[PDB]
Design a protein around this ligand. Structure first.
Ligand SMILES: CCC/C(=N\NC(=N)N)c1ccc(NC(=O)c2cc3cc(OC)ccc3[nH]2)cc1
Ligand SMILES: CCC/C(=N\NC(=N)N)c1ccc(NC(=O)c2cc3cc(OC)ccc3[nH]2)cc1
Lengths: 286, 286
């Protein structure tokens, strides 16, 4: 059964999604009679995922409404009635280029916000992008921070304050590449954008003898001209700057937000319109 | 002043050592009237250092007798009347080869024990080796676990259980070198052994134009033949196998314990004798 404290505040309804380690249910908040989503996770832990998310405040990142630590973990959030982006790209389906741009711009803003706040997501994929409604033109939010990591003063930074009389060479060599952990999120964004634009994955074991690992480390994505002929050259140029193998040469979220593909005032106006529509503000002086 | 709960159980006496972030005092336990050492650390944290050390049980690793979490941290341990190894090697002083072997064997056993138990020290140096008495032939213990790290199931291991459709190439490349963090302790041991045998540091900025960093990453230690002529070739051979730049080719503690320099039954008998002398056993059936 559901725990008493949850049942006290919410009436539980149908499953909206399920799968590995958890489930998402529709529920109704008793006080307001409004729909919420409840994520159930079976017993980074959930507690610290919760702590990270309570500190963040961006319209394209999920917020926690409530939390119950019982036999299982129950996390209450606002219902994203559109569900997972995954369902929009599965089975070779693809989105209009304009719709990809709208969604991708929002993902970039969300991930840029994470990286400014010292957080790396590390599991960005279409399953972890939620859509606010069933219309094509909608707001998205990034979810599932179970793999996320907090950036801070590293062991390396502390080591380098002393004299390295006794320090192993590999630690000194690691100085060249440290502090670029966030670039893993930029690579994932690149893969997501590729899937959205094209309807198919850049790296997969489908009809090839090159191992998935070799495909990825060489950066040689499967390019199928006929699928891409309908997609603009600017869109593909961005994909190529995100799927760079050298993490230091890879586009950051900032570089991506300044790329010509995203200098689209129509797209931006649509986003702003969707934001104000979503929001329920108090009165304002002047 | 000292906190009430400490004063309650112990009478504090003179400073034995001091310096950066802390101090070590002589104290007397009231119940037994015997000498203890009290490490004072000003406010990994100390709490978790304490937790690590309460779980370990090896004669060449310090044990915690008591702990007080007050305005400062006060940690009670058995007094090592010989003090720090540092004082035996400072000012170009060096130890007899036989004494180095005795001490180094103990360091190897201690670090081997750490690595078997999933702990890496990361700050092995002569300041962190304590001597049990003022005689040359004595037991040593490794101390200061403030930089230590616990090995366990990594982020990498969890990532590799899924399909890397969205996984960045640098994570896959890091698979080649992961899981060799412990080799940093072996490098430090090598530096300590070099200092003990020779009276001088292998890498330093003294009378050279090669930066300390370049000296270390190239593995080019300062070899001064006249200082080393008195030292055996077996001793130096071990140093060379520990100061290997490739962490995967570097000698592990096990390889080092099987090296011909450490196949010395006299040394081993001396160690065993010092152990039994230290120990205060209960009666035994047969
Ligand atoms: C703070 C917990 C964040 C989290 N997962 N965290 C985790 N697995 N560690 C998580 C993961 C997924 C979701 N999913 C949803 O909210 C969701 C809403 C929804 C609506 C649908 O139809 C209208 C269909 C699927 C849906 N998933 C919500 C939260
Ligand atoms: C659990 C705390 C371990 C620790 N330091 N930890 C830390 N700095 N984070 C630590 C560091 C150093 C010592 N030092 C000693 O016990 C010590 C004994 C002693 C005796 C001396 O003369 C007879 C002279 C110096 C001495 N240091 C003891 C504990």
């Amino acid at each position: 059964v559901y725990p008493k404290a949850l049942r006290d505040e919410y009436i539980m309804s149908k499953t909206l999604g399920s799968g590995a380690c958890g489930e998402v249910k529709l529920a109704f908040e008793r006080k307001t009679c409004k729909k919420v989503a409840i994520k159930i996770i079976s017993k980074l832990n959930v507690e610290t995922e919760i702590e990270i998310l309570k500190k963040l405040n961006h319209p394209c990142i999920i917020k926690i409404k409530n939390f119950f630590d019982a036999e299982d973990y129950y996390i209450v959030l606002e219902l994203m009635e559109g569900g997972e982006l995954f369902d929009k790209v599965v089975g070779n389906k693809r989105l209009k280029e304009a719709t990809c741009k709208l969604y991708f711009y929002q993902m970039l803003l969300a991930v840029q916000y994470l990286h400014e706040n010292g957080i790396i997501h590390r599991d960005l994929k279409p399953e972890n992008v939620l859509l606010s409604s069933q219309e094509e033109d909608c707001l998205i939010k990034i979810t599932d921070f179970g793999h996320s990591k907090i950036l801070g003063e590293t062991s390396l930074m502390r080591t380098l304050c002393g004299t390295p009389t006794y320090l192993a060479p590999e630690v000194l060599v690691s100085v060249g590449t440290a502090g670029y952990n966030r670039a893993v999120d930029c690579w994932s964004l690149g893969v997501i954008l590729f899937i959205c634009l094209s309807g198919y994955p850049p790296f997969s074991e489908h009809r090839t003898q090159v191992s998935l690992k070799d495909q990825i480390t060489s950066g040689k994505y499967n390019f199928i001209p006929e699928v891409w002929a309908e997609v603009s050259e600017k869109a593909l140029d961005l994909v190529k700057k995100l799927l760079v193998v050298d993490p230091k040469a890879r586009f950051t979220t900032e570089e991506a937000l300044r790329h010509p593909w995203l200098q689209d005032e129509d797209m931006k106006r649509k986003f702003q319109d969707l934001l104000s529509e979503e929001n329920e503000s108090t009165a304002l002086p002047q």
